[PDB]
Amino acid sequence: INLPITGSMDTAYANSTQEETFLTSTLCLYYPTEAATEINDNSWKDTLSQLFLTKGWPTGSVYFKEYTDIASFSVDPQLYCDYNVVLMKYDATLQLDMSELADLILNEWLCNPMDITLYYYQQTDEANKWISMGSSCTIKVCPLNTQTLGIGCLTTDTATFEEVATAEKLVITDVVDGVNHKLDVTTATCTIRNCKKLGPRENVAVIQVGGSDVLDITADPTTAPQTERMMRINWKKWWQVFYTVVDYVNQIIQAMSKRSRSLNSAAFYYRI
Amino acid sequence: QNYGINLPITGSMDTAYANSTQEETFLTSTLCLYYPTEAATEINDNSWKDTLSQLFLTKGWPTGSVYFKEYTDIASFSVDPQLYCDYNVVLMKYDATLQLDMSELADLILNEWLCNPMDITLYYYQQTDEANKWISMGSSCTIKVCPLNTQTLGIGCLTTDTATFEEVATAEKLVITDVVDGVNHKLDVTTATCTIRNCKKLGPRENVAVIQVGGSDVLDITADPTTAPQTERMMRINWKKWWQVFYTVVDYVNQIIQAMSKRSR
Amino acid sequence: INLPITGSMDTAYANSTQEETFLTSTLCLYYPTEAATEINDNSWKDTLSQLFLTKGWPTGSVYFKEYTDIASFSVDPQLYCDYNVVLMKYDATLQLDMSELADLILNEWLCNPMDITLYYYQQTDEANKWISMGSSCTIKVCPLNTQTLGIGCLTTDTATFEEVATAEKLVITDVVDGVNHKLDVTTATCTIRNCKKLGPRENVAVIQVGGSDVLDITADPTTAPQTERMMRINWKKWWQVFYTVVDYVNQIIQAMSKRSRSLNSAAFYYRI
Amino acid sequence: QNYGINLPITGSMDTAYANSTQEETFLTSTLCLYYPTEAATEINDNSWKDTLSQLFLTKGWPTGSVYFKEYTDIASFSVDPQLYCDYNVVLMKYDATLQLDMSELADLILNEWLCNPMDITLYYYQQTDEANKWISMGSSCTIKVCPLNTQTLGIGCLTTDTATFEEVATAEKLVITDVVDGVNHKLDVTTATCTIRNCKKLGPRENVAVIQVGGSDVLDITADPTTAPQTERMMRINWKKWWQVFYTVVDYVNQIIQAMSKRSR
Amino acid sequence: MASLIYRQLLTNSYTVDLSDEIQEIGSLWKEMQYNRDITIRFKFASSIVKSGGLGYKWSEISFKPANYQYTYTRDGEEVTAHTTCSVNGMNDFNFNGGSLPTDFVISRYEVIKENSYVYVDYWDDSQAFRNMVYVRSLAANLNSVICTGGDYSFALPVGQWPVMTGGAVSLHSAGVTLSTQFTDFVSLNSLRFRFRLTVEEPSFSITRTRVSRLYGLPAANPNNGKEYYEVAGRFSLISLVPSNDDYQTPITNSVTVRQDLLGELREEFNALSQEIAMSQLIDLALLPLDMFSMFSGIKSTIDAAKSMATSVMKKFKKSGLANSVSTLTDSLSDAASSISRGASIRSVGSSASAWTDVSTQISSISTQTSTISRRLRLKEMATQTEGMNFDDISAAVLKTKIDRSTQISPNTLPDIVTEASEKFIPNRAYRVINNDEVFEAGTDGRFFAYRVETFDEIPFDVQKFADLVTDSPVISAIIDFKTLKNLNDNYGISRQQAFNLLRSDPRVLREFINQDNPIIRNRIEQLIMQCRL
Ligand SMILES: *[C@@H]1O[C@H](CO)[C@@H](O)[C@H](O)[C@H]1NC(C)=O
Ligand SMILES: *[C@@H]1O[C@H](CO)[C@@H](O)[C@H](O)[C@H]1NC(C)=O
Ligand SMILES: *[C@@H]1O[C@H](CO)[C@@H](O)[C@H](O)[C@H]1NC(C)=O
Ligand SMILES: *[C@@H]1O[C@H](CO)[C@@H](O)[C@H](O)[C@H]1NC(C)=O
Ligand SMILES: [Ca+2]
Ligand SMILES: [Ca+2]
Ligand SMILES: [Ca+2]
Ligand SMILES: [Ca+2]
Ligand SMILES: [Ca+2]
Ligand SMILES: [Ca+2]
Ligand SMILES: [Ca+2]
Ligand SMILES: [Ca+2]
Ligand SMILES: [Ca+2]
Ligand SMILES: [Ca+2]
Ligand SMILES: [Ca+2]
Ligand SMILES: [Ca+2]
């Protein structure tokens, strides 16, 4: 809608959209198996339901989603809810994994597929990256010089390539933007897609349950931002975490806003 | 460049016709055919894809813009149909024992659904309006439903004895269930094998085009029995081979794309 | 005549031309042998004529012409009358055969013959098709490029061509319009002609005696038209069918209209 | 571009004579000769067709516009003559035993007939005007007629004893029957071998040109025994060979095409 | 100017004949960067054919093509390569000791000299030799080789042996072209270089004979036992890979093109018609866009860049335009010559003039005017006009469309230029001025007589309009009387502006088009939309 919008400053503030956005929206928590394990119960979901029922979120609005592992979740996340919350455990050995997950679900991507054998791909701008998903993505890449020959590599020998990943489930590969790269990837087990980053996804809310903030959404090491839907909690149990979430859900839904672009269930749009 | 906003558009009736978009939208778009395995079996060739692409080349669709995506059967294609292209054509064989399956498939792909998840074990749901339904996908869905009165008691069914529930599906790879809009139902599903989603039908996806290759037009998209409509992108052919079908699709692809309009969502 | 016509809206409606077009025209039914067999009579034709004589159609104006089957009729239909009615049964196997029969008789074609061994032909517009008749036409096609070489086929090995028709008595082939094709055909049994479709033949009238309306006259899968002189009946006998025809023949002839192009005894014009 | 109507035409006498259409119709039209097997026999040359085409090339007709179509005999040609070209020439031999046969052939091809079918078994037909005739074709026809009186009884014939009928044809491949116009006739015909059609004679077919290669002009196109006309496209030739005849045709083809005019229908 | 380009095509048509002679006696996009290195190892062959008798005489010692298949290292990968060497243009000498059966005779033997040329087709399994399907430029810089002949003894069963020795020539690389190697099921695209021969010091000789101090290289033993001769260098090659939205660079070039066949090119032209502007178009319609300037901005393929102008000319001299021109010239000549038996068809004018000979009439004055106006299209490209010369606007549209249109190809531009020249502005009007009285005319059967200062119609004086249009210069109807009068009424106009619009002057035209005059913008847009194809 290229058309403009006009307004004023004398108009009166309307009633609160809260207490109706709850009825007309849904909420979905994503929780790790560790939580249900430490809980050791089978009615905690109905308990949180009846608690939300006091906080104003009606009965058939809340949903829960167990995800066994951060990487297992990173493998093709399917988010279709008018409000999403994700409880992310801290693990220093998974810093880049749960930064890539953040960069993937917090923001909106427009993705084209990739045929490594029939084509040689590149980047255009500083927002055109290669996201690879799957069970074991071992990627290697050769940059080609001005005369379509390899730089520190050979177009025929895959050993000479530069290994950027090693048996990962999700990789966000950024390379020099303006050169042609040949690739070699485990195309049987992983699909790699050339995606452009767009305006953010205001529908999700990541909540790091452990240590100090580490998530670098921005792939350039100059911004290092911290957004409003990127939260942090200190934990020794999980019931306290869920009670916190319940008691302060209104603040989280103030930090979030329903998307504008379109309807979809994935972490990224497909446009071929 | 307002997003997610709607505003009045304005114009006039003296404007000169701007352009002629065919042969440019072709270059800047992608087309995707969805054919059955029967067709490749009858063809018995390893180069027919390249052949059809070279043919489309005459119609203007360049080489790396046309795609083919086989599907074993209507059921296998209805299980999570991931149509992601700028133009989609689907060929669909006729079988009187599959009318409802290949009408559900049409209702699913032709129309744009907004689908929230469903948790049966905890919550008891109801349909609000006439465009609210429950679409269940998976290997084999088996749905059973017990309507409930105002005091959360069953009507012709026992909330504890699942056997008393009323069966609406039996090992189907896709169900689209419409029940009495205004009463709460308790559901039973093979959740370990199939997923059910509470969906609302928005306007129609103008990106796809179904082509019934055989029998008469039977697709009752709208659940209500009064309309039984037939849209522009609901086509019909009579066949005795498949090469003729593909040649016809090619020779009349421009009409198909004039019948289809790129997405709004 | 390229000259223009003129008229007015104050002129009055003249008397009925029905009850004189019967006296100065002829009618010709085309029924299947199944009808005669089910009936098991000899003077049913005289019966129908003496019935017609009440509706106005005189004695020596009605004609009944038998055809053993749909394909036998499809092979060179010699319609030469001032009004033609055809009764055609329903058969899911012969669906396309009796759609091609419709496309052939309902419409007027201008046909040029073809010399396959010596030449290679193409199509120009959306109405230039290739119609082949005979005992069994088994056609195979191989498209070519600008330099007379095959596309997905080999010009020598006939077994690599694309078989569009396998043992069909009447075939109406539409191929991609713009490219040159090479054809392999059973010239000893079938003759194939490049025919352009002119305006409709308003002299004939098809009656589907059985199931739902399936005839797709126009080969493009967007129109799927239902023309005026394309009727449908449900049957358990044939006497009821013929009585319905006789009782509602004036409507059939009101939906038909004598030709304008020319006098010709064939179902298509021949102009070399 | 109105069709099926007759509108008044206008003109003048001040317009100038336009350039000639010959050497343009010669390219945008087609020619078709019909010769007897006797000619090819006497000749015994497998290249005479290409020779005559190369000779026509000088007179203007291109190579792929001329056609030669053989025929074994006048009667075997009279049996279902399917003439479809833009200029047709027919060569015809003189044989006193075939006078009426090769006059019927002329009266058939030179003229344009509006032909409806006939049901001998059921109906008893009659001729309304002097131009409604009954033309019968096949391998061998045997027609027998019986007129009727006011009360549907025979006149010198019995409606049951076919033998009493009057015999107008005896083992003929083509027959053109004109009977008393205004009385109902019954017919007996061997319909297994022959088909009879009730035809009405219209304006001449200006597309065909008959050439009697032999004796005096006997062809009486018109059935009334008062006119006995000789038309423009009704030619005669004297012969002792066939190469000379074909050279004559090739050298005087422009005169033939001037004596002929393309069809109106 | 923009019609001068058509005049130049017609003028330079004479090159099509010699081009066809040569051909007979012979027979979005992107860019990828070769200038890769190569080493060519090859060798010659020989074909010796002896006569019978006692064995002292030979009837042929000739050259023969020679294949070779080897492997070498480049950028750290072992690449398998394949060469094919042959020769052309050699001097066939002969030795003859007598007619007796026992006298040494070589009836014919070949020697390559400076007037010969050798060709070495090359191929390997790298990526360039599958990507070189659409080339933009090709040129190679290779070192030279010195190839010398070795000892060869003739097997005489009796007596002493003749010893062939010496001989040497230097191959330097001069010329690179494409070729093909034909396999059993597929074909391979290859790169054939041409080396020129330069004779060297060692003089070939035939011992025990009167042949010595004879330079060149014969076919007896050209390799001198060497397994091969080896040149080394770099080959520079540019590609026309049909890429897309700026990523996914192909490899193997991954495309087919319109060779599988205009139906859609016409639609492209009808989409590009109205986007064209008017002020800049009039600025471009005054430029003499001769062959270079018309065919420079086309990023052609290596064959189209060689035959583009000739390619369009060989079809441009087949069209209604060229045939009508030749017909007019023949009519004029036959009229100037045939007077004694003079062609008396018609003459609407003072005396017989081929410009005023109505014919093929399949109002009388309307017909005469249209028929006379169908030859002012020939006046346009016969330089007897004064104004914007409508074919010029047509050619400007053509040059403005064929620089944008993606669908342009070697087989394709020919007969597009001609369909343009034939179907651009089919109906078009012209005028002639005489003593301040303008007589117009148009091929659509319309005529208008009118005075310059005060536009008011007048009876159209035929037999005077013809006498004037025959000899006097003509003008075009870009500003035709209808729009001219609408303008003089609404947008009140001055004497000089009106005179310049009658003369169809681009200065005043572009001045109105910049003053935003809809009564001229509409007319120019009509002309564009008629220039549709
Ligand atoms: C807005 O809020 C005020 C204060 O609570 C309330 O009085 C008013 O009714 C609200 N507006 C509407 C439209 O209900
Ligand atoms: C038309 O019908 C009217 C009413 O029956 C009758 O009076 C009239 O004569 C008819 N027209 C002719 C031409 O007979
Ligand atoms: C007819 O002849 C005249 C006189 O030579 C000539 O001017 C005219 O162009 C000719 N007609 C055609 C169609 O060429
Ligand atoms: C049509 O053309 C105008 C200008 O010629 C351009 O601004 C517009 O974007 C074009 N329309 C489309 C759909 O590209
Ligand atoms: Ca990772
Ligand atoms: Ca980057
Ligand atoms: Ca390396
Ligand atoms: Ca189903
Ligand atoms: Ca029950
Ligand atoms: Ca419902
Ligand atoms: Ca058929
Ligand atoms: Ca094949
Ligand atoms: Ca077609
Ligand atoms: Ca006879
Ligand atoms: Ca008798
Ligand atoms: Ca008579």
Swiss-Prot record, chains B, D:
Transmembrane segments: none annotated. GO terms for biological process: receptor-mediated virion attachment to host cell. Ca(2+) 1 binds at D45, G156, T164, E166. N-glycosylated. Disulfide bonds join C32-C85, C115-C199, C141-C194, C146-C157. Residues 115-117 are annotated as: CNP motif. Keywords: Calcium, Capsid protein, Disulfide bond, Glycoprotein, Host endoplasmic reticulum, Host-virus interaction, Metal-binding, Outer capsid protein, Signal, T=13 icosahedral capsid protein, Virion. It is found in: Virion; Host endoplasmic reticulum lumen. Glycans are attached at N19. Ca(2+) 2 binds at Q127, D178, V179, D181, D251. Its main location: virion. It comes from the Viruses. Residues 203-205 are annotated as: GPR motif. GO terms for molecular function: metal ion binding. Residues 187-189 are annotated as: LVD motif. GO terms for cellular component: host cell endoplasmic reticulum lumen; T=13 icosahedral viral capsid; viral outer capsid. Some rotavirus strains are neuraminidase-sensitive and require sialic acid to attach to the cell surface. Some rotavirus strains are integrin-dependent. Some rotavirus strains depend on ganglioside for their entry into the host cell. Hsp70 also seems to be involved in the entry of some strains. In group A rotaviruses, VP7 defines the G serotype. Calcium-binding protein that interacts with rotavirus cell receptors once the initial attachment by VP4 has been achieved. Rotavirus attachment and entry into the host cell probably involves multiple sequential contacts between the outer capsid proteins VP4 and VP7, and the cell receptors. Following entry into the host cell, low intracellular or intravesicular Ca(2+) concentration probably causes the calcium-stabilized VP7 trimers to dissociate from the virion. This step is probably necessary for the membrane-disrupting entry step and the release of VP4, which is locked onto the virion by VP7. Belongs to the rotavirus VP7 family. Homotrimer; disulfide-linked. 2 Ca(2+) ions bound at each subunit interface in the trimer hold the trimer together. Interacts with the intermediate capsid protein VP6. Interacts with the outer capsid protein VP5*. Interacts with host integrin heterodimer ITGAV/ITGB3. This is Outer capsid glycoprotein VP7. The chain holds residues 51 to 315 of 326 of the full protein.
